Amino acid sequence: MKLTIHEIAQVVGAKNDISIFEDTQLEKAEFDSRLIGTGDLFVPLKGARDGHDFIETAFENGAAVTLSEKEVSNHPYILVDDVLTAFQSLASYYLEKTTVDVFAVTGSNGKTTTKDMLAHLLSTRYKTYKTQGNYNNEIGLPYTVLHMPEGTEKLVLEMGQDHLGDIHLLSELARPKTAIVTLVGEAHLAFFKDRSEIAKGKMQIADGMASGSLLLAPADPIVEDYLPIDKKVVRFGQGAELEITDLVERKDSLTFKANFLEQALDLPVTGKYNATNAMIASYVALQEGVSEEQIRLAFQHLELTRNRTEWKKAANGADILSDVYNANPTAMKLILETFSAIPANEGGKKIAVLADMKELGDQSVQLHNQMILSLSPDVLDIVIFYGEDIAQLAQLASQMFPIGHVYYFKKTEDQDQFEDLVKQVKESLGAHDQILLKGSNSMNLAKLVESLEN
Ligand SMILES: N#Cc1c(NC(=O)c2cc(S(=O)(=O)N3CCOCC3)c(Cl)cc2Cl)sc2c1CCN(Cc1ccc(O)cc1)C2
Q1: Bridge partners of 242?
Q2: Alpha-carbon distance 324 to 308, whole Å?
Q3: Angstrom distance (rounded) from CA 402 to CA 392
Q4: DSSP H helical segments within 214-291, as ranges?
Q5: Distance 21 CA to ligand 1 centre (A)
Q6: Which residues lie below 8 Å from residue 284, measured CB to CB, with a gap of 6+?
Q7: Cα–Cα distance measured from residue 83 to residue 202, given in angstroms and rounded to the nearest whole number
Q8: 181 within 8 A of 205, measured Cβ to Cβ
Q9: What function is annotated for this protein (predicted)?
Q10: Which residues are annotated as a binding site?
Q11: Contact yes or no for 160/115 (Cβ under 8 A)
């Protein structure tokens, strides 16, 4: 990250006197205090607690300067109106300065995403960086841009949406060279009206793209009214300008041929949607000067990720939502709001299994309690706490919640009521019930869900 503080304070609009602190060359940018090294820029956001609380801690860890929405004593800080807003600006500007080729992608669905596939393909010929894990939103994307290894030639960004209009924001930020739109099978929906609003919001991806730029989009008539008018649009799907003309799915592997490819392709994956992901990633890669030779070979040794946490289903038809990704409180908070923001199925309730989060040192217990502000009795019918540090939160909830709507289960160096946890959960869960399971990946938590999908 080739950035200095004085430069950061220009682009960012610093509200304070900046030439007071030395203009040092920054290193890494982080919002999670635990990740700060020497020379790092702290960016304090509205999480479970406000970032600014950990400005103190960030410099103990070696931060050289931090973004701030207030006066900060004897520490290099940049004064601004909205740290997040500042943070976006900073990312836009860094793209404009390094001038990397950005490839914008949507829908995470499969065992391997179009974001993963494409990066992997581009990596055979060019120096490539990409979105890590699920950092695809108004926090996630800036963060990626600012973590780009010095010299990256191509950058595959994934962009996702919570509300309509979010992708517009990022396509405007990133001003992509090329974009891919894919469609992920529906739940009973999120904060959206229908598949239409969704597709409308998804198609926004080209808002920040130049004329005659390349955009792939589904054969599906639903995207029709939302196509750009001055772009190079290449549709994929049965009967379209690109289609898989044959397919074989084995136990683990999968072979297929695309009309515009002279040879078959081989992936160690399964599901028709993975072939479609492979083809389109495969087609843009051709546009960027990668040989079909180099591509067959790359697919040879492909990388399955962690299952990009959608909904699954237990052995009674009840909707599970297990979120492995991001072990940290703001992520606990965010999902709780997502979970409870969703409507419950008809004649079916809303359970939450929360488990100890880790690596919170001397703040664990404070931070676990903080979750209470995201726990409504209105929406959440039963709430199951497992672990130790969750304790007081379990207590808090038992106060705020109707009698016998809360269960606690111990886990320490002296006892492990896991056996009982399971017994309880498998009594609470019904054929129309939605269940969240969030907390540090542990042997015991992973152990639980397989018994549910038994
Ligand atoms: N609030 C809060 C905290 C964090 N929040 C986040 O990491 C965070 C995570 C997320 S996120 O949900 O993980 N997000 C990342 C990218 O976009 C998709 C999902 C977001 Cl969007 C925003 C934030 Cl600010 S990380 C963190 C805290 C407070 C506690 N922490 C450790 C700590 C322990 C003891 C101390 O004394 C100091 C710090 C680290």
Answers
A1: 236
A2: 9
A3: 17
A4: 272-287
A5: 27
A6: 103, 118, 178, 180, 214, 216
A7: 27
A8: yes
A9: Involved in cell wall formation. Catalyzes the final step in the synthesis of UDP-N-acetylmuramoyl-pentapeptide, the precursor of murein.
A10: 107-113
A11: no
209 within 8 A of 227, measured Cβ to Cβ: no
For atom 5 of ligand 1, the residue with the nearest CA is 330
- Alpha-carbon dihedral of residues 125, 126, 131, 137, nearest 10 degrees? -120
Regarding the beta carbon of 49 and ligand 1, being less than 6 Å apart is answered yes
Residue 38 to residue 62: CA distance in whole angstroms: 4
Annotated binding site for ATP: 107-113
The domain limits of the chain are 1-80, 81-303, 304-454
β-strands 254-258, 244-249: how paired? antiparallel
Q: Tokens for 202, please give them.
A: 């998804």
What is the number of the ligand 1 atom nearest to the C-alpha of 134? 18
**Alpha carbon distance 33, 45 (integer Å):** 11
3 state DSSP class of 236: strand
- How far does the centroid of ligand 1 lie from the alpha carbon of residue 389, in Å? 17
Highest CATH level, class, for 1-80: alpha beta
DSSP of 55-88: HHHHHHTT-SEEEESS--TTS-EEE-S-HHHHHH
Instruction: Assign domain 304-454 one CATH number from 2.30.300.10, 3.90.190.20, 2.40.50.140, 3.40.50.1820.
Output: 3.90.190.20
- CB of 48 sitting under 6 A from ligand 1: yes
H or E stretch including 154?
strand 154-158
Rounded to the nearest angstrom, the distance between the alpha carbon of 165 and the centre of ligand 1 is 25
Tell me how the structure was determined.
Answer: X-ray
For 391, counting Cβ atoms within 10 Å of its Cβ (0-12 exposed, 13-18 middle, 19+ buried), the class is middle
Q: How far apart are CA 333 and CA 373, in angstroms?
A: 9
List CB contacts of 308: < 8 A, sequence separation 6 or more.
108, 109, 110, 113, 134, 325
Look at the domain 81-303 and name its fold: UDP-N-acetylmuramoyl-L-alanine:D-glutamate ligase (3.40.1190)
d(CA 199, CA 354) in angstroms, rounded, equals 33
Q: How many angstroms is the resolution?
A: 2.9
Residue 86 CA, distance from chain mean position: 21
45 lines ligand 1 (CB under 6 A): yes
Q: How far is CA 438 from CA 238, 323, 354, 435, in A?
A: 39, 6, 5, 10
> Could you give the CA distance from residue 72 to residue 258 in angstroms, rounded to a whole number?
59
Q: Is 379 in the pocket of ligand 1 (CB under 6 A)?
A: no
